[PDB]
Ligand binder design. Structure first.
Ligand SMILES: *[C@@H]1O[C@H](CO)[C@@H](O[C@@H]2O[C@H](CO)[C@@H](O)[C@H](O)[C@H]2NC(C)=O)[C@H](O)[C@H]1NC(C)=O
Ligand SMILES: *[C@@H]1O[C@H](CO)[C@@H](O[C@@H]2O[C@H](CO)[C@@H](O)[C@H](O)[C@H]2NC(C)=O)[C@H](O)[C@H]1NC(C)=O
Ligand SMILES: *[C@@H]1O[C@H](CO)[C@@H](O)[C@H](O)[C@H]1NC(C)=O
Ligand SMILES: *[C@@H]1O[C@H](CO)[C@@H](O)[C@H](O)[C@H]1NC(C)=O
Ligand SMILES: *[C@@H]1O[C@H](CO)[C@@H](O)[C@H](O)[C@H]1NC(C)=O
Length: 1210
């Protein structure tokens, strides 16, 4: 009757991927040519050109999207056009072509390292379809806790999408959180270096998992297990505390575990006041287990929110909309107070509508599901509401009784836009669907006979849509000779990696009258990977020192990356999560609606809303859019990382290699992820291999022992054979250590089944470094039966020998002498002698000394200065705190040579769009105001601040003159020689106003703000300020005012009254290494203004340059005062101090050949280019402490710091 088209394409186009475009025809046509073209900025390509048929036919194809014109984002138009018989359909819509973000992660082999170990890390980058990419990382950097780049890798290539890089830490690497940052972006991975010892057991809460307010008492089961799965006996101390927003009430439980290793005790509600409004409903169970003999302890903390929820139901599988005059279906998940599956609970159901309120009573099943089917014949196309409750009566809660309530299920249903009386309904598929299994979808339909047109075939077009893109399609054809009967057909679907975790299915049918009948559901698929990889072991538990078979099952042509780590590492620090939820979560939230760039809105629930809720553009002339009204072994091993490997996968898809178990009785958590270019990414579940021995030895020893004390060694012997035995242990005696005559290191003891016994020694360490401790156990034959039975001897593994290292550090208090130098040749050779001297009362073998060369001041945060320009602001005080740092950032960058034209152009565009937003904030008195025209008189601090900003902003963008002169005249009018300052304004932000900002510092700040753009001394508006401030320096009050007075007399051109208060300023400088600083946040302001004062005089000596580098080395470590706009004026003074420092003395490195020499002619040569000048280079000094000469040649300055650490006796 009326022929019509329908064109489907996704909303968000993604450049590295292919997409789908689809066209649906009608009977008729057959001479009108439909072509669809994507008009982008530079060109226009056609998608598909096709002609109509005598039936409906869903014709669709893939395509490659053109690149965006802007580089990362472009709004393109899509246009369908059909020509023929002198008529031409044309219709255009807006789509968005953006470059999608490639998800990058990095993992390490451990989350925790000792000093002296090796850090391996893998960097993987993915598309949104989890296919790996081989783009070039520009720079991988590895950074200290002091934000010093200790390693970098330039232009690194991934193989098969993954790259693995290694770093050997120094054995005196300083502790803390080290960072791996990738490709100069927000992708980082942290790891801690600290002094630890591996724990052998895990304590966990078991029975309190969720708690209810209505229960009377609850059992606490604290249960603790070894890493190899065996229980122990140990003293348990549990604190069960309720906190408050005031003493906190706790109940403390003391106990001993049993043969199952679990400890249970009841706790009553009378301990905790669960009725108090001022008391929190979060209870804290902190358990501490000290196991018997050795005295080593472990913790287990769990914060439980006690629940006032008594019963919760939600509409689990129920559509959001109903068809008029057709039955509605849904099903409700009903849960109790503990989210349990209720046994046949009585669930009431009340509706809300214009016809009235109806009631229904239903009984759930064993799984708590409530299938309900409702008759919608009388609702008559109205917005209805559904409420699933526990009782008909409104719920009454008593303040005297405990808080308890029921979560009633609430839902709002809208009528579907029905211009026809036909029906679609898809039965939902319950819980989380298995990925890759072919699911059967059973859809019911009812075709109206008056809208049937039974002389032609009726077609059903379906799209299965995942992550905002068309995945699979079809058009089921069936005869209209059935006419009107309640029928059902089926669809065979398959969910894969391209499908969402919650993909959607849209089914419609178009009648020749023009009507559409449709239904859309959302599925629920588990987080799936197309590369189905399984990592397995056989026999999956074996004695240590033996070979297991390791099996990868991935797609053929994959590169697998395998990590097998000890569980004892994971008991200290939990590693960063590499699970399927984490990999899916870094691609943000899937494509729910149209973007704001290409959003369509009504100019004033249907199939257009169906394709909007999946984020797909529809173009159709049908009735789509609704009208809108508005035997022995030695156990030496490496118990930190067992396996860290890359494995190619052949054509079989299975790789089985033999790997040897390390000699630690523990559990190895193993995991693997594989990358294939055809199939994509796959992630194995974490499996475990239990390395276990029947009876064995275990040392209890700390990490570091200082030399010459006595420490308690505790060797525990475990027996897990099922009968009583007799052991004989012996500790090896060597010259590395001494013992205090504890039974001559030979004891024999009868130890029974499932039991541990601990021998103690107290040991003096005598030789420095890593020393060994060897102890062995043998089961000897019993001449007499101990315990009533003869001592059991096994057939295999009758002896166990264990060797464990101990780090030994020298005794005495550690003192350090640090010495700084700035070697800056300017075309010459610059040399400097450094003497290493020490008193003669040292402990021997304590003198460590290392030199450090660093080519550039400050580490990562110069790239954070690029991040300071973004997020534009034009409302409130958000603009004035952000317009100011930009000119100082580019002032520092153009004086350091790191300014590029792209960030310059983007920054001056930001200066234009912020410069035009400072004119409506201008006060009516010719001043400046935070509100704009309201604030009273002009604020002296804010007008001084904007004369500071626009006095330096004319060298980048055009600034009008007249604001400077009328602001100058208002400084002349608002200041008197009798009375200066007169602050009448305030900042909009709370608890931060800038500096200390009293009256004398405000006068000093405004008088500093008057000069240094075009002005000098003895002007009329600075003469009254210096008359106010000549006697202000005589007062010698405060520290911020003192440093700012030292700065404002540095710009006055005098050298007599400014150096006299620097003598009382440098003596109170607190010293941290070779980085001296002051503190009265505010400390950065004091150091920046003191640095700005010290580099103002034209005569500069090398002691002042060394003092300036000492200030700058403290300013280099700050990365929150600059790099973020959290402070209104700390960033501007810090960057102008660093910019004036780079003006005066320090140009950064370009090429320095440095060489150090000693008395033993130890010639050590450092080469510093312009590409590794941020790499913190260092080297130890093997020569006995004395003379060291330092000579550098080339262009640039280098910072050379010599640190000598040694220990002395008090
Ligand atoms: C994500 O990875 C893809 C794959 O390399 C990148 O696509 C490349 O983009 C550059 C841009 O200059 C093109 O020259 C290449 O031809 C593209 N390659 C492919 C295979 O499409 C994409 O730019 C990356 N996106 C991000 C945000 O890094
Ligand atoms: C403990 O003594 C041994 C023997 O001198 C040291 O070296 C080990 O030697 C065996 C011999 O094959 C190797 O298999 C081990 O891998 C070595 N251990 C290492 C490299 O850690 C051992 O270093 C000593 N322990 C110390 C000094 O802490
Ligand atoms: C366990 O908790 C206590 C109390 O805060 C703390 O002193 C102790 O260091 C903790 N032990 C470990 C291994 O975290
Ligand atoms: C993927 O995640 C789901 C839960 O989101 C869960 O089944 C499991 O952690 C993973 N399953 C598979 C098969 O990877
Ligand atoms: C060291 O061991 C001996 C032998 O048992 C003991 O008498 C002495 O008290 C121990 N010293 C310390 C400090 O524990």
């Amino acid at each position: 009757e009326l022929p019509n088209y329908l064109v489907t394409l996704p909303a968000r186009l993604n450049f590295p991927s292919v997409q789908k475009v689809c066209l649906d025809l009608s009977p008729g046509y057959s001479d009108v040519k439909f072509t669809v073209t994507l008009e982008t900025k530079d060109k226009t390509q056609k998608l598909l050109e096709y002609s109509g048929l005598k039936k409906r036919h869903l014709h669709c194809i893939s395509f490659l999207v053109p690149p965006p014109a802007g580089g990362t984002e472009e709004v393109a138009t899509i246009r369908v056009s059909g020509v023929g018989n002198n008529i031409s359909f044309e219709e255009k819509k807006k789509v968005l072509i953006q470059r999608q973000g490639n998800g990058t992660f990095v993992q390490t082999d451990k989350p925790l390292y000792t000093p002296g170990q090796q850090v391996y890390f893998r960097i993987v980058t993915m598309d949104s379809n989890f296919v790996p990419v081989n783009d070039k990382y520009s720079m991988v950097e590895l950074q200290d806790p002091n934000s010093n780049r200790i390693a970098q890798w330039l232009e690194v290539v991934p193989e098969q999408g993954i790259v693995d890089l290694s770093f050997q830490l120094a054995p005196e690497a300083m502790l803390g959180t080290y960072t791996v940052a990738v490709a100069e972006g927000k992708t980082f991975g942290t790891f801690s270096v600290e002094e630890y010892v591996l724990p052998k057991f895990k304590v966990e809460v078991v029975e309190p998992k969720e708690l209810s307010t209505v229960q009377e008492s609850f059992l606490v089961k604290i249960c603790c297990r070894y890493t190899y799965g065996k229980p122990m006996l140990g003293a348990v101390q549990v604190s069960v505390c309720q906190k408050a927003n005031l003493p906190d009430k706790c109940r403390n439980l003391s106990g001993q575990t049993d043969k199952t290793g679990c400890f249970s005790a009841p706790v009553d509600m009378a301990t905790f006041d669960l009725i108090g409004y001022a008391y929190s409903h979060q209870i804290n169970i902190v358990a501490t287990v000290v196991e018997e003999g050795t005295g080593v302890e472990a913790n287990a903390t769990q914060n439980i929110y006690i629940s006032p929820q008594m019963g919760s139901m939600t509409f689990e599988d129920t559509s959001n909309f109903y068809h008029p005059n057709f039955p509605f279906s849904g099903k409700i998940r009903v849960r109790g107070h503990d989210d349990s599956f209720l046994k046949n609970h009585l669930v009431f159901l009340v509706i809300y509508g214009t016809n009235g309120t109806f009631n229904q009573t239903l009984v759930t099943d064993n799984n708590g599901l409530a299938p309900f089917t409702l008759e919608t014949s009388g609702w008559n196309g109205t917005d209805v509401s559904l409420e699933g409750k526990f009782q008909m009566e409104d719920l009454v809660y008593n303040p005297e009784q405990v808080p308890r309530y029921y979560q009633n299920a609430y839902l709002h249903l809208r009528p579907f836009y029905s211009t026809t009386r036909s029906f679609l309904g898809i039965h939902r598929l319950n819980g989380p669907l298995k990925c890759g299994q072919p699911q059967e979808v059973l859809v019911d339909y009812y075709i109206d006979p008056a809208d049937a047109s039974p002389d032609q075939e009726i077609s059903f077009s379906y799209y299965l849509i995942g992550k905002g893109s068309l995945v699979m399609e079809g058009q089921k054809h069936l005869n209209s000779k059935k006419k009107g009967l309640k029928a059902s057909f089926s669809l065979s679907l398959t969910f894969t990696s391209r499908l969402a975790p919650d993909p959607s299915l849209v089914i419609y049918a178009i009648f020749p009258s023009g009507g559409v009948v449709a239904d859309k559901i959302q599925f629920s698929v588990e987080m799936c990977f197309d590369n189905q990889v399984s990592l397995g072991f056989s026999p999956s538990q074996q004695l240590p020192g033996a070979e297991v078979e390791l099996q990868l099952q991935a797609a053929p042509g994959s590169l697998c990356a395998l990590r097998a780590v000890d569980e004892s590492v994971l008991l200290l620090r939990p590693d960063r999560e590499l699970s399927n939820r984490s990999v899916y979560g870094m691609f943000p939230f899937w494509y729910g609606h149209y973007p704001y760039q290409v959003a369509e809105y009504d100019q004033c629930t249907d199939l257009f809303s169906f394709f909007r809720d999946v984020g797909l553009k529809i173009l159709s002339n049908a009735k789509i859019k609704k009208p809108v009204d508005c035997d022995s072994q030695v156990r030496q091993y490496f118990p930190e990382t067992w396996l860290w490997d890359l494995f190619p996968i052949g054509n079989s898809g299975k790789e089985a290699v033999h790997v040897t178990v390390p000699d630690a009785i523990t559990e190895w958590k193993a995991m693997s992820f594989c990358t294939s270019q055809s199939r994509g990414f796959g992630l194995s579940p974490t499996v475990g291999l239990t390395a276990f021995k029947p009876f064995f030895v275990d040392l209890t020893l700390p990490y570091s022992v200082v030399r010459g004390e006595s420490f308690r060694l505790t060797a525990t012997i475990f027996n897990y054979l099922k009968d009583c035995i007799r052991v004989q242990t012996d500790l090896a005696k060597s010259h590395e250590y001494q013992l205090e005559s504890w039974a001559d290191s030979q004891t024999s003891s009868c130890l029974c089944a499932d039991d541990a016994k601990t021998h103690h020694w107290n040991i003096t360490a005598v030789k420095l470094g890593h020393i060994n401790f060897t102890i062995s156990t043998k089961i000897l034959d019993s001449n007499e039966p101990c315990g009533g039975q003869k001592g059991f001897v096994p057939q295999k593994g009758r002896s166990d020998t264990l060797i464990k290292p101990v780090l030994v550090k020298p005794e005495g208090v550690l003192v350090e002498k640090t010495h700084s130098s700035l070697l800056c040749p300017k075309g010459k050779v610059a040399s400097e002698s450094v003497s290493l001297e020490l008193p003669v009362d040292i402990v021997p073998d304590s003198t460590k000394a290392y030199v450090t060369v660093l080519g550039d001041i400050m580490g990562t945060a110069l790239q954070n200065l690029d991040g300071l320009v973004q997020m534009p602001s034009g409302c409130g005080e958000q603009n004035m705190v952000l317009f100011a740092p930009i000119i100082y950032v580019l002032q520092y960058l153009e004086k350091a040579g790191l300014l590029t034209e792209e960030i310059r152009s983007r920054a001056v565009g930001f200066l234009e769009i912020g410069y035009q937003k400072e004119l409506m904030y201008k006060h009516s008195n010719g001043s400046y105001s935070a509100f704009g025209e309201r604030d009273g008189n002009g604020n002296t601090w804010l007008t001084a601040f904007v004369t500071k900003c626009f006095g330096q902003a004319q060298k980048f963008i055009f600034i009008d003159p007249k604001n400077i002169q009328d602001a100058l005249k208002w400084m002349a009018g608002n200041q008197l020689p009798s009375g200066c300052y007169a602050n009448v304004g305030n900042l909009l932000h709370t608890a931060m106003k800038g500096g200390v900002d009293d009256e004398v510092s405000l006068t000093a700040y405004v008088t500093a703000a008057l000069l240094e753009m075009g002005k000098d001394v003895d002007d009329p508006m600075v003469s009254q300020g210096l008359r106010c401030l000549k006697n202000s320096a005589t007062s010698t009050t405060n520290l911020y005012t003192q440093a700012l007075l030292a700065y404002i007399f540095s710009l006055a051109g005098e050298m007599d009254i400014r150096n006299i208060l620097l003598k009382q300023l440098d003596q109170q400088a607190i010293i941290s290494g070779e980085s001296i600083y002051w503190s009265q946040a505010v400390d950065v302001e004091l150091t920046a203004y003191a640095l700005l004062a010290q580099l103002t005089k034209p005569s500069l000596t090398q002691k002042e340059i060394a003092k300036a580098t000492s200030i700058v080395a403290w300013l280099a470590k700050q990365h929150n005062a600059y790099g973020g706009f959290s402070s209104t004026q700390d960033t501007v003074v810090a960057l102008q101090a660093l910019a004036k420092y780079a003006t005066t003395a320090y140009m950064p490195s370009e090429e320095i050949n440095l060489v150090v020499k000693s008395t033993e002619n130890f010639q050590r040569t450092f080469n510093i280019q312009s590409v590794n000048r941020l790499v913190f280079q260092q080297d130890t000094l093997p020569n006995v402490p004395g003379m060291y000469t330092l000579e550098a040649s080339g262009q640039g300055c280098v910072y050379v710091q010599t640190v000598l650490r040694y220990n002395i006796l008090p």
